[PDB]
Design a protein around this ligand. Structure first.
Ligand code: LBV
Length: 310
């Protein structure tokens, strides 16, 4: 059972309790975007990342308590209609905003219970071709190789691996596409503890996560608890959520500045990950993550199909 989070007096995580870190409720985000939470009926802004006012060019005193009706007059009606009470928390509303201070922004919203969680991130044929290349791959090894190469072409990531889970939850790199000069991980195996049980569980439900800068400090939400509930804000579905410090350290020690993975789910089980690295920090574009999500779904389908062919 999970430890309390750090802001509720929980311990700093160590290697004796990796599996007890409540990674879904860090009460903080990555600094390359901003996060607001809002009441699902009134649109009152209930929580904001500490960088939100600066990120959005708003006056801090105005921002909290403000309504989405006032902050987002052009999206609020659409947002309400798209995300009514009781909808799947996987359901998304997305809009592109031309924000004077911030530039071109992507807004992604989902509902958890009575709370709307709004993520603002800068934004900046290929999909169909990629989907068809996966389809047309003749066997599982070729499928793995095509998936890693295609994802690398689309993203420009220094390394893209297909990381397959064994029944004991150890992991193996079974294909990779890599920048010239990077050492090979192909065929290397890693302990189950490096992607602990609660992470593997989360990754069965929320299929993409990333760390854009492995040296960046997390930006707290304020207030840290959802005022509706006096309880933690569920961020398992927020790509902006802070990454486990233990994992961030693991990445820095690998010389990885940016990391992103996409779940491969076969028969409702976590089969593996498309796992990506960059040496420098790197914010992968939002619509481009959408493409990666589609490719993850296609790969998951094709792994099942290819495993059936044998
Ligand atoms: C004591 C806890 C530990 C720990 C925790 C931890 N690890 C993750 C997430 C990931 N770990 C990954 C592992 C690898 N990436 C690689 O490139 C290789 C090897 C070539 C390995 C073994 C991966 C891929 C992830 C997924 C996230 C990503 O793609 O960057 C988490 C969950 C992080 C989060 O979602 O907040 C946690 C808590 N890792 C350890 O090594 C020990 C110290």
């Amino acid at each position: 059972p999970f430890f309390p989070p750090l802001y509720l007096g929980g311990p700093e995580i160590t290697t004796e309790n990796c599996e007890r870190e409540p990674i879904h409720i860090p009460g903080s985000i990555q600094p390359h975007g901003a996060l607001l939470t809002a009441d699902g009926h009134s649109g009152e802004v209930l929580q904001m990342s500490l960088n939100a006012a600066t990120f959005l060019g708003q006056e801090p005193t105005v921002l909290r308590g403000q309504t989405l009706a006032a902050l987002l007059p052009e999206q609020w009606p659409a947002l309400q209609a798209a995300l009514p009470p009781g909808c799947p928390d996987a359901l998304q509303y997305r809009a592109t905003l031309d924000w004077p201070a911030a530039g071109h922004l992507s807004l992604t919203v989902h509902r958890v219970g009575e709370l709307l969680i709004l993520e603002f991130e800068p934004t900046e044929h290929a999909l169909r071709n990629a989907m068809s290349a996966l389809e047309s791959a003749p066997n599982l090894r070729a499928l793995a190789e095509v998936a890693t190469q295609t994802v690398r072409e689309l993203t420009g990531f220094d390394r893209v691996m297909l990381y397959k889970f064994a029944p004991d939850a150890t992991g193996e790199v079974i294909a990779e596409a890599r920048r010239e000069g990077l050492h090979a991980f192909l065929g290397h195996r890693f302990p189950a503890s490096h992607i602990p049980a609660q992470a593997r569980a989360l990754y069965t439900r929320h299929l993409l996560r990333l760390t854009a800068d492995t040296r960046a400090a997390a930006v707290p939400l304020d207030p840290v608890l959802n005022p509706q509930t006096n309880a933690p804000t569920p961020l398992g579905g927020a790509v902006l959520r802070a990454t486990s410090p233990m994992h961030m350290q693991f990445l820095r020690n690998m010389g990885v500045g940016s990391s992103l993975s996409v779940s491969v789910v076969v028969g409702g089980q976590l089969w593996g990950l498309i796992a990506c690295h960059h040496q420098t920090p790197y914010v992968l574009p939002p619509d481009l993550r959408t493409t990666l999500e589609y490719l993850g779904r296609e790969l998951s389908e094709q792994v099942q199909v290819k495993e059936a062919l044998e």
